[PDB]
Amino acid sequence: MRVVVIGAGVIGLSTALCIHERYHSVLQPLDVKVYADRFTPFTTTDVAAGLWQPYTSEPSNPQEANWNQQTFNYLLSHIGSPNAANMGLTPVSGYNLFREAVPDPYWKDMVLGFRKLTPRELDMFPDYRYGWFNTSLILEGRKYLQWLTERLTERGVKFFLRKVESFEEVARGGADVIINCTGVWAGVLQPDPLLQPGRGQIIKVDAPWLKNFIITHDLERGIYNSPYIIPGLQAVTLGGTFQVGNWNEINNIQDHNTIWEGCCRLEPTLKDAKIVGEYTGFRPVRPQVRLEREQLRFGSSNTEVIHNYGHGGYGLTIHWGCALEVAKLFGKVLEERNL
């Protein structure tokens, strides 16, 4: 069966893998290919802060929290193996600062060791008045992508520089199924005003002494508009913006400073950190994730699509969960074809 996964961000890959991993030898032939106009280091995924942490607010389609939970476990499960950092994974602990008290996140129990910070702790940051502490995981985009890639590759999945113009295209081509994991740019293949770019610029900097993440929150300014600092496998990511509907893909000096000054302020020692890079990306913002099946008639032949997009600022945090669901639907699709 000809399957075509469009997009090679964390979503496309995991998904592809997951499907193949689950059905390769459940169905004999099973042909998977991945088309994408961008591959790492060019995906949005490549620019994510790399932390597992869903938004504070309980998800609209409640199953999302499961996907999140499932993603976290899967990840955690790897922590212990030798390859975990080779997958781009590692545990990290850190803070979430606030200016006023606030309700515990629904994921309070998915993460390890969640607890409200004490005053002494808070004294470590004079701006904030309230916050939490917990340990979690770093799952780095680029590395994970490459891992995922090698995995798929050895599994025989094939990749292709392609810019799909239409699903039609792909279908006239031969795809029995098509899995749309085109991120923000999904709208192009089929409009979806729900979907929008959540622009975010960041700065990578070299400062090995920071071992914990620190994420501040301005309830007014909106989420991820406040300074944040996230240690990674080697560099640290300085961050602070999330602009909806903004599509400029260039790093802007203004933002650069607002990030630089804000973090520097939050974390004073940053004064000596050396900047090694700046990047900007589009969070595939959407009220909810679109992950559902859709049949498409072209001539006398039907073609199956399965959407998986709009993971906003938690694409990594919940990638796996969805990847599973798709496989699930994908399966139903096979049942209907009678295998």
Ligand X SMILES: Cc1cc2c(cc1C)[n+](C(=O)C(C)C)c1c(=O)[nH]c(=O)nc-1n2C[C@H](O)[C@H](O)[C@H](O)COP(=O)([O-])OP(=O)(O)OC[C@H]1O[C@@H](n2cnc3c(N)ncnc32)[C@H](O)[C@@H]1O
State the residues that interact with a second copy by CB under 8 A: 76, 79-86, 90-93, 112-113, 115, 118, 120-121, 123-126, 133, 135, 138, 208-212, 231, 233-234, 268-269, 271-272
| Contact partner at residue 38 from a second copy, ligand X, none, CB < 5 to 8 Å by partner kind | ligand X
Instruction: Give the footprint of ligand X on residues 303-332 (CB under 6 A).
Output: 309, 311-317
CA neighbor of 47 nearest in space, from 207, 210, 230: 230
Closest to 67 measured CA to CA, from 329, 320, 331 = 320
- Does residue 169 belong to the site contacting ligand X (CB under 6 A)? no
The span from the CA of 9 to the CA of 309, in Å, is 11
Asked if residues 178 and 6 have their Cβ atoms less than 8 Å apart, the reply is yes
15 interacts with ligand X by CB under 6 A: no
Which does residue 71 touch among ligand X, a second copy, none (CB within 5 to 8 A, set by kind)?
none
Distance CA 258, CA 315 (A): 25
Subset of 176-215 contacting ligand X (CB under 6 A): 181-183, 185, 189, 200, 202
Q: Is 38 in the site for ligand X (CB under 6 A)?
A: yes
- 11 marked ligand binding residue: yes
Considering only the stretches 16-24, 101-109, 281-289, 290-298, report the one whose residues sit in contact with ligand X under the rule CB under 6 A: 281-289
224 is an annotated ligand-binding site residue: yes
Q: How many residues bind ligand X (CB under 6 A)?
A: 44
The DSSP secondary structure of 60-105, one letter per residue, reads SSTHHHHHHHHHHHHHHHHBTBTTHHHHTEEEEEEEEEESS--PPP
Q: Is 277 annotated as ligand-binding?
A: no
Min separation Cβ 246 and ligand X, Å: 12
* 9 lies in the binding site for ligand X (CB under 6 A): yes
What's the CA dihedral at 324, 140, 148, 184 to 10 degrees?
60
Q: What are phi and psi of 303, to 5 degrees?
A: -145, 130
Residue 38 phi/psi, 5-degree rounding, is -140, 140
Q: Which two tokens stand for residue 232?
A: 């990674």
Site for ligand X in 211-250 (CB under 6 A): 224, 228, 239
The minimum distance between CB 175 and a second copy, in angstroms, equals: 39
Contact between 235 and 203 under an 8 Å Cβ cutoff? The reply is no
Instruction: Give the pair of three-digit tokens for residue 28.
Output: 């004999």
* Residue closer to a second copy (CB basis): 271 or 297: 271
User: Binding site membership for D-serine: which residues?
Assistant: 224, 228, 283, 313
User: Binding site membership for FAD: which residues?
Assistant: 8-11, 37-38, 43-45, 49-51, 163-164, 182, 283, 312-313, 315-317
User: Binding site membership for D-dopa: which residues?
Assistant: 53, 283, 313
